[PDB]
């Protein structure tokens, strides 16, 4: 594993120091349907016309990004995604910009959102939850070794591919940092205590989010919830979590070690690091190598009708992609 990481960091660094730019154009793609939306952007199913290859394209409005003060975070997402490579991370295939927007063209994950399936199904069995959790663990092992913090783990950002495996998407809050960072980032339900306590935080927040994710997958609802954010933040600091009775003993134990407010006792952030997780009882049946190699039998396979199918996603109101005659925030996004 150390051999693999050393090699991974070399390839990563090369790309980080010399990032790729404008490797495609908008009119080479056929806009087919909006797959999802958010803050100041939307993701659509697109077809590369010359090849017939389908892709997922995120479109950001430059002015909207500036308005929401996401300039630096956006540049981070662009520079990091073009430099990383892991089977469970969505691969940025092309990126370009025009007078009005920023474009990220990535591998399309036809299976849909984990959020969708979990809400519809209610909750995942422990083995089903364990399967996804293992992919996240390995992904965080990879990302962290590169000094990257993800900061937005949640069902909404995890898509299922054709094989029923996970594809981590949306690196809008990802950042390469050594030491502590301070940005109040994330989604309320998955924020670690340190993020709300202004003392700064490190990679350990991703491990707390993992604990929230495993909890929500196995229970059907988050460990900390309430009508408004402020109510949520308070529960997160009370350091008290209630577990459903159907939770196994090993699962409750792992969770207590993951949702640990004391940063000196939280798993993933200790002396043995990620291994304290990989070797925990709840993961005894998990074959880490087989998972990385994608050879473990997926508990859920969202088969679909040929390429370009969007049946596993919801319906959104379509909107035209506007491109002014005037170049907008040219300077601000010059390196994108």
């Amino acid at each position: 594993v150390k051999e693999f990481l050393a090699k991974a960091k070399e390839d990563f660094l090369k790309k980080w120091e010399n990032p790729a730019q404008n490797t495609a154009h908008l009119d080479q793609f056929e806009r087919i349907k909006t797959l999802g939306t958010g803050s100041f952007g939307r993701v659509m199913l697109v077809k590369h016309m010359e090849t017939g290859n389908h892709y997922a394209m995120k479109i950001l409005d430059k002015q909207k990004v500036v308005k929401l003060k996401q300039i630096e975070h956006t540049l981070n997402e662009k520079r990091i995604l073009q430099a990383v490579n892991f089977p469970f991370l969505v691969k940025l295939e092309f990126s370009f910009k025009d007078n009005s927007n920023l474009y990220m063209v990535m591998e399309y994950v036809p299976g849909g959102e984990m959020f969708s399936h979990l809400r519809r199904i209610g909750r995942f069995s422990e083995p089903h939850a364990r399967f996804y959790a293992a992919q996240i663990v390995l992904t965080f092992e990879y990302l962290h070794s590169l000094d990257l913090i993800y900061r937005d783990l949640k069902p909404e950002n995890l898509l299922i591919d054709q094989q029923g495996y996970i594809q981590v998407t949306d690196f809008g809050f990802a950042k390469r940092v050594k030491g502590r960072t301070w940005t109040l980032c994330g989604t309320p339900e998955y924020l670690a205590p340190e993020i709300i306590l202004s003392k700064g935080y490190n990679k350990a927040v991703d491990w707390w989010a993992l604990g929230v994710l495993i909890y929500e997958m196995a229970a059907g609802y988050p460990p900390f919830f309430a009508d408004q954010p402020i109510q949520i933040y308070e529960k997160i600091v009370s350091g008290k979590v209630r577990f459903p009775s159907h939770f196994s003993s090993d699962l409750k134990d792992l969770l207590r070690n993951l949702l640990q407010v004391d940063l000196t006792k939280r798993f993933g952030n200790l002396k043995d690091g990620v291994n304290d997780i990989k070797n925990h009882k709840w993961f005894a049946t998990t074959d880490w190598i087989a998972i990385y190699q994608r050879k473990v039998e997926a508990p859920f396979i969202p088969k679909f009708k040929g390429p370009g199918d969007t049946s596993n996603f919801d319906d959104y109101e379509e909107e035209e992609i506007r491109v002014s005659i005037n170049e907008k925030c040219g300077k601000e996004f010059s390196e994108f």
Binding site: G38, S39, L68, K69, Q70, F115, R119, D152, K154, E156, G172, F173, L184, C185, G186, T187, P188, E189, G220, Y221, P222, F225, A226, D227, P229, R242, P244
Partner: peptide
Amino acid sequence: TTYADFIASGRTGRRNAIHD
């Protein structure tokens, strides 16, 4: 039940991230 309280909450839909 906890499930009922969650489903009756306004936070069962896609959750928007917090920026600033």
